[PDB]
Amino acid sequence: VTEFLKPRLVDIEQVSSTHAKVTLEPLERGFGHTLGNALRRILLSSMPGCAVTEVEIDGVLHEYSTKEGVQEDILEILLNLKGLAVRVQGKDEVILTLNKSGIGPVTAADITHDGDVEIVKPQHVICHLTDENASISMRIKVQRGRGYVPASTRILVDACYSPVERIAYNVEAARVEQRTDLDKLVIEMETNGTIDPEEAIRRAATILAEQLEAFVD
Amino acid sequence: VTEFLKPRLVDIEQVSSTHAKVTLEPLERGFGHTLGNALRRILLSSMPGCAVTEVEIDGVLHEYSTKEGVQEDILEILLNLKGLAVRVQGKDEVILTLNKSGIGPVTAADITHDGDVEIVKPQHVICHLTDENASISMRIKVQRGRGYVPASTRIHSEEDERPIGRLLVDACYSPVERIAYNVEAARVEQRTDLDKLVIEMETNGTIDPEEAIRRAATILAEQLEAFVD
Amino acid sequence: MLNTCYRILGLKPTVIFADQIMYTGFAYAARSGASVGIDDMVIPEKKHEII
Amino acid sequence: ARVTVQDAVEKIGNRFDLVLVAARRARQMQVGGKDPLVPEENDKTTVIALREIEEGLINNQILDVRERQEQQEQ
Amino acid sequence: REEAVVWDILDEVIREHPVLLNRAPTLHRLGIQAFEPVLIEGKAIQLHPLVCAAYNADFDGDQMAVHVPLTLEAQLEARALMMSTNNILSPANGEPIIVPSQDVVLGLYYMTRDCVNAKGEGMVLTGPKEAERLYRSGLASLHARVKVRIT
Amino acid sequence: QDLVVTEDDCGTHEGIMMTPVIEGGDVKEPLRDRVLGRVTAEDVLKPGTADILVPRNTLLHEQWCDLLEENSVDAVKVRSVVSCDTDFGVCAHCYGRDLARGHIINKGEAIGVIAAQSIGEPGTQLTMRESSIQVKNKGSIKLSNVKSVVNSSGKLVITSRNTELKLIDEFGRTKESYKVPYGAVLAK
Amino acid sequence: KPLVGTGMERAVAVDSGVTAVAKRGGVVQYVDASRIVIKVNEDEMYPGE
Amino acid sequence: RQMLRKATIVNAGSSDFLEGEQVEYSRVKIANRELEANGKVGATYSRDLLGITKASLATESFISAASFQETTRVLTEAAVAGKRDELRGLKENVIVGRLIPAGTGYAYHQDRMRRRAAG
Amino acid sequence: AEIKELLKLGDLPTSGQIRLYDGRTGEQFERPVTVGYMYMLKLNHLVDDKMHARSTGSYSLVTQQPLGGKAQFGGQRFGEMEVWALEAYGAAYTLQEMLTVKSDDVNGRTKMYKNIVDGNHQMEPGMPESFNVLLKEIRSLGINIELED
């Protein structure tokens, strides 16, 4: 009458740290499918996290600038900065600046390693190699927010608060004893990193269960 | 969370004895639709209500034969009664019994309505007897259930049972079977503009609407957490 | 595109692409909708003189 | 299950002798006395034999050599 | 008695056992194909809209033929030769048979189409979240001139 | 019921000449597809003299088509059926691939078995139902052995009823024949 | 009745000879679900009937 | 290519003074006779093509060319021939059910031929 | 035009198009569509009526094959066009089985059942058993030049 089943088999197979797929056990009808829809809509349209937003480099502020030997235009450097989920432990958005030699190999560790400012992949290029040896200040900022917000209206490069890259859900069929009407759920994804899959699933389930105590009261 | 502003239900309206409209305080976008979806699912499909499982009459067997005077036959009576619904207590497997003598209109007053068998819509078109010598007495077992099913399912459980005369009856069992979840952007002024959700739920009397809201959202939390593993 | 793919890639990627294509096509078709009605056909009135 | 069969075709080429080799291998694998050199994944002898052939370990020569060696060792 | 073990055995045996399905009126070699059966709780077999043309029918009423390769060689031949996963091009003229003629193409076209310029037509991006915006808000396919770095 | 794959090659220089189908107004069928799945004889030579285009036994995988198109070559003597010096079945050097076999036809095959139906395939067919001369574009005459005799006017009358032109614009590619009878007078 | 009509259905059912027609009747008195008794008015009640 | 067979001839060429002989049969005879033994054994042949119904009558397997449209006359004819179908066509190997010399059966038949090689 | 006026009078769009909310993911679908209530009816041919299966049923009186004006174990026999096409596949084993299992002579039926139960999945070419019977014929074996090799 009211004994409600749930997806018990939560076995997840990960191709790498950036490729994985989790599955749900055969549950009640309409729960795997609608639940998968809700979960994907959640992990996309709202995801808790912190990352870079924009930078303040020395020179002209126009996007149509010259490489001037940097061989890295403003778009190249800004993109190589923005997709890095630059993280601050408990503080608000943290500003960092950098200045180094002209090796050319641009990575993510040359920034001033602050108490709270950190990067998951220290080899993440933030710029393209140059043809000279001058120095300059990056002066970028890493912010934390709710879900994700664009940079076209929230100027300036990109603010990747939601750490989700590509998500999909599929529904399979499973029987119990004679009836196969078990529309089981599974979700497959590829990502950038730093969010453990079971941990992220736990965070989502926790937000959902902690808020769903009111409409039922 | 981050100033999650967990809301609460407010101004839940009940227009009639067979529906209700619940308003709620505002919440976020990109979730209110999904939450309303899950709520409607858990309230309508896995819905603890009451329906009719067995039928019987001493003169009327499984065959669709019109009762003396009664214009409708056995299948036809089943249809005409199906347009209504009946009540059982917290205990299921209640029984209502529609019995009437004369030639006047057939309605639910002359039917077994008890403290654990309750009637709200008591004047259905129930194929009134037309012959004076007729006196109709059909008994419908009204039990409690959750999900749609046919009558051949009970063949195995009632094989030496369901003998010549006992009618086994099926149902579609979605004791809500209608609940609308609407997410709009309102009820938020001081903080971020937020989405408030309205539930236009409706039953045939089997269960209470706010009760269905609580049951559905409890299931929402339950299956919501299950994603943790 | 399919022919070029079969020329360049091979059979297995071809099958994968075709299946994903059927799926994504159904997806977009359910996404746009794009109904049809009488007004979706608008008759020019010019022939009314020309004829 | 195996979706496409192309590697075994490239290992055979004739597209006809591949079926005969896979059959003469699966027959032995099903009747007994042999052991799958490829780690099985809860699959029947046909797909196992076919994947072992596509891997580059079973053909119309190694099988005959092994059969002759087993017959001479009696 | 039709126990669960019966169904489990049936599934396990079929899990390694594909079948062949074929059209009644017989014209082309494309009229018979081999597919990995999946059990169905229906009454009429569902065919992948892939070879719908290859069947030379149009979702109208027809019973199709079922074939089981009892010989091991029969299985080898069907999964090898009668494989639809093998039958790709129209072997008559060589033309690639596998061709979406149903609304799959319609969706493919509507995806790469834009009336004049929709909301956020001028938006410029990199790729990972275009569907994130389109599914929720920010841009549409009927948008034009959206810059995007392409890898 | 006779056709079967048994002979790998013909070994016979005998072959057939294939040219683009310049039918009606222009090339009803370019000679870029008619033999792509064909292997020719030693006839492969580049349009330049003492320049070869391809070897004796060669299958135009994909680039010999483009290379020959670079030469504007329209016809070639190629291996084919019947001429397959096999007298039972044919050369596999005279059968091709013509199906998903991206490789040449395998032995023991019966192409005619695959045939005998492809003709019968589209039964959706239908049954039961020298003065006006215009040129397509720039081109040459190519009267193709048309007998010229003294005419009443200042030209050469066609003493042969088998007088057929051919439009050569810039290379061997032709546009139209526009054959005219013996009663035609060369207006150009 | 399907909502959209052409007007031919009622007349066709009349000519279908499958429904029940009332021949020279005035008032239906006793209706059983199998027996229909109609009291034909004396104007429609012929003498001797 | 099928549309012609059973070629017409003029010169016996030490081969035979007949007409309508298989062009391939004549060619094989000439190759095995002219180059091998007697080049002067040179029989002139005129190849021809005809209608589908007629050349339908022309077949090697006496079992074949019998069921085609009728066999009773063909029965008389083959009996006079006392000929052997010799397991000629693939449809013949089907009639016997034998490895139709196609696909795995071909090589199988060829393996049979291999078995038929030494005996 | 009267329809559009009625839709206005019926508090409905004159074009009739209207947006929709998805039943699976609930995303607003662009391009508002028109809907209505169309008349539907079912066909006399029934799916249950169509459904049929048989792998081993009852044979009829002529030629040991299954039949006899009974809708039991019904099974369309193979097609001559179908047989030609099946040969075109070159599945000589499969075709040899269809002509070696799929019909009437239950004589090797026992062998087939025993092999399948053993999982042997094996058959013997033998003779068209019926052409062995046609030898029984042979003008009463009058024609037996049969040089079996």
From Swiss-Prot, chain A:
Residues 1-217 are annotated as: Alpha N-terminal domain (alpha-NTD). Keywords: Acetylation, ADP-ribosylation, DNA-directed RNA polymerase, Nucleotidyltransferase, Transcription, Transferase. One of its GO terms (biological process) is DNA-templated transcription initiation. It comes from the Bacteria. GO terms for cellular component: cytoplasm; cytosol; cytosolic DNA-directed RNA polymerase complex; membrane; transcription elongation factor complex. It is an enzyme of class 2 (transferase). (Microbial infection) ADP-ribosylated on both alpha subunits by the phage T4 protein ModA. ADP-ribosylated on only one of the alpha subunits by the phage T4 protein Alt. It catalyses: RNA(n) + a ribonucleoside 5'-triphosphate = RNA(n+1) + diphosphate. Disulfide bonds: none annotated. Belongs to the RNA polymerase alpha chain family. Homodimer. The RNAP catalytic core consists of 2 alpha, 1 beta, 1 beta' and 1 omega subunit. When a sigma factor is associated with the core the holoenzyme is formed, which can initiate transcription. Both the N- and C-terminus interact with different regions of transcriptional regulator CRP. The rRNA transcription and antitermination complex (rrnTAC) consists of RNAP, NusA, NusB, NusE (rpsJ), NusG, SubB, ribosomal protein S4, DNA and precursor rRNA; S4 is more flexible than other subunits. This is DNA-directed RNA polymerase subunit alpha. The gene is rpoA. The chain holds residues 5 to 233 of 329 of the full protein.
UniProtKB/Swiss-Prot annotation, chain D:
The keyword Transferase applies. Keywords: DNA-directed RNA polymerase, Nucleotidyltransferase, Transcription, Transferase. It catalyses: RNA(n) + a ribonucleoside 5'-triphosphate = RNA(n+1) + diphosphate. Its EC number is 2.7.7.6. It is an enzyme of class 2 (transferase). The keyword Ligase does not apply. Promotes RNA polymerase (RNAP) assembly. Latches the N- and C-terminal regions of the beta' subunit thereby facilitating its interaction with the beta and alpha subunits. Belongs to the RNA polymerase subunit omega family. This is DNA-directed RNA polymerase subunit omega. It comes from Escherichia coli (strain K12).
UniProtKB/Swiss-Prot annotation, chain G:
It comes from the Bacteria. Signal peptide: none annotated. Acetylated on several lysine residues in the presence of glucose. Co-administration of salinamide and rifampicin or salinamide and myxopyronin suppresses the emergence of resistance to both antibiotics. DNA-dependent RNA polymerase (RNAP) catalyzes the transcription of DNA into RNA using the four ribonucleoside triphosphates as substrates. Resistance to the antibiotics salinamide A, salinamide B, rifampicin, streptolydigin, CBR703, myxopyronin, and lipiarmycin can result from mutations in this protein. The RNAP catalytic core consists of 2 alpha, 1 beta, 1 beta' and 1 omega subunit. When a sigma factor is associated with the core the holoenzyme is formed, which can initiate transcription. The rRNA transcription and antitermination complex (rrnTAC) consists of RNAP, NusA, NusB, NusE (rpsJ), NusG, SubB, ribosomal protein S4, DNA and precursor rRNA; S4 is more flexible than other subunits. In pull-down experiments interacts with CedA. Belongs to the RNA polymerase beta chain family. This is DNA-directed RNA polymerase subunit beta. It comes from Escherichia coli (strain K12).
From Swiss-Prot, chain H:
Disulfide bonds: none annotated. It comes from the Bacteria. Acetylated on several lysine residues in the presence of glucose. Co-administration of salinamide and rifampicin or salinamide and myxopyronin suppresses the emergence of resistance to both antibiotics. The RNAP catalytic core consists of 2 alpha, 1 beta, 1 beta' and 1 omega subunit. When a sigma factor is associated with the core the holoenzyme is formed, which can initiate transcription. The rRNA transcription and antitermination complex (rrnTAC) consists of RNAP, NusA, NusB, NusE (rpsJ), NusG, SubB, ribosomal protein S4, DNA and precursor rRNA; S4 is more flexible than other subunits. DNA-dependent RNA polymerase (RNAP) catalyzes the transcription of DNA into RNA using the four ribonucleoside triphosphates as substrates. Belongs to the RNA polymerase beta' chain family. This is DNA-directed RNA polymerase subunit beta'. It comes from Escherichia coli (strain K12).
